[PDB]
Write a protein that binds this ligand. Structure first.
Ligand SMILES: *[C@@H]1O[C@H](CO)[C@@H](O[C@@H]2O[C@H](CO)[C@@H](O[C@@H]3O[C@H](CO[C@H]4O[C@H](CO)[C@@H](O)[C@H](O[C@H]5O[C@H](CO)[C@@H](O)[C@H](O)[C@@H]5O[C@H]5O[C@H](CO)[C@@H](O)[C@H](O)[C@@H]5O)[C@@H]4O)[C@@H](O)[C@H](O[C@H]4O[C@H](CO)[C@@H](O)[C@H](O)[C@@H]4O[C@H]4O[C@H](CO)[C@@H](O)[C@H](O)[C@@H]4O)[C@@H]3O)[C@H](O)[C@H]2NC(C)=O)[C@H](O)[C@H]1NC(C)=O
Ligand SMILES: O=C(NCC1(O)CCN(C(=O)OCc2ccc(OC(F)(F)F)c(F)c2)CC1)c1ccc2[nH]nnc2c1
Ligand SMILES: [Ca+2]
Ligand SMILES: [Ca+2]
Ligand SMILES: [Cl-]
Ligand SMILES: [K+]
Ligand code: NA
Ligand SMILES: [Zn+2]
Length: 806
């Protein structure tokens, strides 16, 4: 209950929300049904429209008008945004030649350039090009400021997870808004789009820009607007705020548009009805920019034009029904649509089995338009698992489709022709970024980047220190003229050992054998040099990875590869090798098929053994440097050392062998040599971070050999492919993956076919940033290049997506 019998006189869009039950006048009061009786009368004037006509010029101030054309309006701060154009012979902002903004040009009393965030819902990336004819204002920002061809949203590509990711720099799994609709088992509460529960602060984790700004003494406009408040009024409210006295004037603001998402849902992303919403949003940008010009703020304010996600073509007839797969369909709750999340309808039903449910949804129909996963098996790039609000069972839906429980759900809710929410690598889901002002660069194109990175930059722009978040601070310095953040490389925490030959073959008792008994001076001197690292500049191109946690490991050098071998985990943390364009693929000789060789540099106590693999009927093993890419028959013996061995399910060796025997060569061929760093990942608690040893849930039977949840590779080469990988002068090029180490290939529906038909597709699905791998390994890569650190950070956030062009 609100005692709504107070007043909004002189309080319209107050910046400090008042406490119940005195009535409110803030831009959110409508949503709380708590505005004063006179809020509409006083704060939402509409009289005479939003534009000055030639005959309103010089007029006498009539307070009933929505905006003014009187002589005193400039200094009252409440002219219609086009006042100067109509009444003072000024030009619109969009008609003006664009001019570099080298320094902020601000009125006396402005301590910093204000930031204005102009956020647009459902603004698909290709709109910039495709709708350019009807968006002159937006096109001017884009082409005159700093722009990316697109920005990558987070998964799910839904509204709240993405807006709250912009605001916080955090993955939805960390911020808590993991969908538009959520159930939290601990609260025993439900969050929905429509309703009051979403206003409860317990849903919202992390620290959004407005709170960061506030705590650090930077005043913020209130970010959120009630639906009923028309765009024109929001714009005027922002401009009014910017005329306030210095001590009361906020430094950061947000505008939000419900369009083009609203129409996109009805009409599809490119429906002819979409031209009008795009014109309208442009008109609004024009109003903003014209109003900034009027206040002499158009060369002072940094403006960000940013979308939450794109829009895809989706119709009712493209719906998969869980009733066609499950007979038990009433015992489950489905969160539906462009993603699927499944839980038990009742906690008291012990006839519920996720295992049998996944199986009943796995590869059942030839053209199946979703794939079920246990959340921990989702591609690690989605970072979508570490929250009690994310159900164990998840369905990734093909672009253009929906998933629903029963057909009755669809027709007793075709209405819609567009939707969004799919995998964040999907082209149709990509969105927009433009930065324009003194702090952003002039006429500059930057590569696509992830929306998780912007929070850092908005802090940079405002002189704020960002709260801990998922961006890599410095990775977007290239967007900025100044205000850059100069990061320093994290310090190495563990230094390696360099073991020499310390053990005799007979001290090992590992149950391993090798037919290596078939045994010069020119070449004994030679292989000695190889074990001291004579070829190390070839195979270790960027320096060694730094270990950022306390542990015990050995650098091991070889002719063809170098490794950092962990005495704690009994396997390398990383194995680094270079494969030039000219390299030859050989087979494993017949005699050496089961060959494993004790490593005379490493104690038996800190080694794996063959016996455990023999006894473990589930687990086989593979190698990190592949025997197939050995440089010579004699170097091949090195690839079979017990210290190059890692545990692998037979089902995964199919994947791994095909990568090593076929794809490394192809990449060397296509990219003019590659440098490969490969290794194991342990993430049993699926938090995207390196497990400590006491977190491993699985060992090779009867041993302390820990089983990875995943295997990674970072594959680097020269961005200028006319230069070989091992002699690159300039910028680098990288693609990486984090393949799940699974006992079956259920994920890949074509897996009973030859590896050339499915392995690569699986790998592409599990593409990753080097930065994802760093989090999962406590390693820091690219420590020694000739490249600047900021450029290396960008490189480390790059994701190779395998989508066609935008
Ligand atoms: C992306 O970036 C983010 C941001 O940096 C990364 O997330 C951080 O990671 C840290 C490491 O995991 C983690 O640090 C821990 O802090 C714990 C206290 O955290 C509270 O306070 C902070 C600060 O204000 C707050 O942000 C937290 O908010 C969480 O929880 C609320 C509700 O309670 C949510 O609303 C909110 O969304 C957020 O939830 C998310 O994080 C939690 C983890 O806290 C997840 O569980 C959720 O699923 C959700 O995703 C908290 O209110 C602190 O308790 C930890 O300390 C333990 O471990 C240390 C080791 O240093 C040890 O010294 C202690 O003994 C202690 O262990 C004790 O508890 C154990 C478990 O109960 C128990 O087994 C032991 O016996 C001990 O008693 C730890 O230091 C930090 O909280 C999060 N921050 C955020 C915002 O998410 C994220 O890693 C990045 N992701 C990637 C892939 O890089
Ligand atoms: O609009 C929808 N629902 C209503 C809504 O809550 C109204 C209030 N609101 C707002 O005014 O937000 C400003 C803002 C702008 C930017 C930010 O972040 C920042 F600042 F970082 F950009 C930031 F946190 C906040 C957000 C949207 C909606 C849309 C499309 C859909 N499709 N399917 N379902 C859907 C539901
Ligand atoms: Ca949205
Ligand atoms: Ca972990
Ligand atoms: Cl959702
Ligand atoms: K075995
Ligand atoms: Na299969
Ligand atoms: Zn939408």
């Amino acid at each position: 209950w609100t005692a709504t019998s107070g007043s909004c006189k002189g309080r319209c869009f107050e910046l400090q929300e008042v406490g119940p039950p005195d009535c409110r006048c803030d831009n959110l009061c409508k949503s709380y049904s708590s505005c004063c009786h006179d809020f509409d009368e006083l704060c939402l004037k509409t009289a005479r429209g939003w534009e000055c006509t030639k005959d309103r010029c010089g007029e006498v101030r009539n307070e009933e008008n929505a905006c003014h054309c009187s002589e005193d309006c400039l200094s009252r701060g409440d002219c219609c945004t086009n006042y100067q154009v109509v009444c003072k012979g000024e030009s619109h902002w969009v008609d003006d030649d664009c001019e570099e903004i080298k320094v902020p040009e601000c009125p006396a009393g402005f301590v910093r350039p204000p930031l204005i965030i102009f956020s647009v819902d459902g603004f698909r990336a290709s709109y910039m090009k495709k709708g350019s004819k009807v968006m002159p204002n937006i096109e001017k920002l884009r082409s005159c400021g700093t722009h990316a061809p697109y920005m990558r949203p987070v998964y799910p590509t839904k509204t709240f997870p993405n807006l709250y990711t912009l605001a916080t720099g955090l993955y939805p799994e960390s911020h808590g808004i993991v969908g538009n609709s959520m159930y939290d088992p601990v609260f025993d509460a439900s969050f929905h789009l429509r309703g009051r529960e979403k206003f409860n602060h317990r849903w919202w984790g992390g620290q959004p820009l407005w709170i960061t700004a506030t705590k650090q003494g930077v005043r913020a406009g209130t970010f959120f607007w009630s639906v009923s408040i028309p765009h024109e009024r929001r714009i005027l409210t922002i401009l009014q705020w910017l005329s306030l006295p210095d001590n009361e004037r906020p430094s950061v603001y947000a505008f939000y548009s419900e369009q083009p998402d609203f129409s996109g849902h009805k009409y599809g992303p490119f429906g002819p009805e979409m031209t009008n919403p795009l014109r309208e949003i442009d008109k609004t940008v024009g109003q903003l920019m014209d109003g900034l010009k009027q206040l002499r703020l158009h060369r002072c304010v940094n403006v960000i034009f940013v979308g939450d996600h794109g829009m895809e073509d989706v119709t009712c007839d493209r719906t998969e029904f869980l009733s066609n797969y499950l007979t038990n369909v009433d015992d489950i709750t489905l969160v539906p649509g462009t993603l699927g999340r499944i839980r038990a309808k009742s906690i008291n039903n012990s006839k519920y089995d996720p295992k049998t449910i996944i199986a009943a949804l796995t590869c059942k129909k030839p053209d199946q338009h979703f794939k079920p996963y246990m959340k921990q098996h989702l591609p690690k790039r989605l970072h979508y698992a570490n929250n009690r609000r994310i159900e164990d069972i998840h369905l990734l839906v093909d672009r253009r489709w929906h998933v629903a429980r029963k057909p009755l759900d669809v027709y007793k809710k075709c209405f819609f022709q567009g939707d969004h929410g799919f995998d964040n690598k999907v082209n149709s889901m990509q969105t927009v970024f433009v930065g324009y002002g003194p702090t952003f660069k002039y006429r500059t194109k930057v590569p696509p980047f992830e929306n998780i990175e912007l929070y850092n930059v908005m802090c940079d722009l405002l002189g704020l220190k960002p709260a801990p978040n998922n961006g890599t601070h410095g990775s977007l310095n290239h967007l900025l003229r100044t205000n850059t953040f100069r990061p320093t490389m994290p310090d190495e925490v563990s230094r390696p050992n360099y073991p020499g030959i310390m053990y005799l073959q007979s001290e090992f008792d590992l149950g391993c054998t090798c037919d290596d008994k078939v045994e010069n001076k020119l070449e004994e001197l030679n292989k000695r040099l190889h074990t001291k690292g004579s070829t190390k500049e070839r195979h270790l191109l960027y320096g060694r990875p730094a270990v950022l946690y306390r542990t015990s490991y050995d650098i091991l050098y070889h002719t063809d590869f170098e490794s950092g071998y962990s005495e704690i985990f009994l396997m390398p943390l990383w194995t680094s090798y270079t494969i030039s364009k000219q390299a030859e693929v050989s087979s494993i000789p017949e005699h050496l098929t089961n060959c494993v060789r004790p490593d005379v540099r490493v104690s038996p106590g800190f080694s794996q053994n063959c016996l455990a693999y023999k006894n473990d009927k589930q687990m086989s093993y593979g190698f990190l440097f592949p025997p197939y890419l050995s440089s010579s028959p004699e170097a091949k013996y090195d690839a079979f050392l017990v210290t190059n061995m890692v545990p692998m399910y037979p089902a995964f060796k199919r994947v791994w062998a095909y990568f090593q025997r076929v794809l490394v060569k192809k990449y060397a061929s296509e990219r003019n040599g590659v440098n490969v760093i490969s290794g194991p990942i342990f993430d049993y608690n699926y938090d995207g971070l390196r497990d400590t040893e006491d977190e491993i849930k699985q060992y090779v039977e009867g041993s302390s050999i820990p089983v990875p949840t995943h295997y990674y590779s970072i594959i680097t080469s020269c961005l200028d492919f006319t230069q070989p990988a091992d002699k690159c002068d300039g910028p680098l090029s990288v693609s990486s993956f984090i393949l799940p180490h699974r006992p079956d290939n259920d994920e890949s529906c074509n897996s009973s076919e030859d590896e050339s038909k499915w392995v690569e597709e699986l790998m592409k699905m599990h593409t990753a940033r080097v930065r994802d791998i760093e989090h999962l390994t406590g390693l820091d890569f690219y420590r020694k290049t000739s490249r600047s650190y900021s450029e290396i950070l960008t490189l480390k956030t790059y994701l190779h997506t395998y989508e066609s062009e935008i």
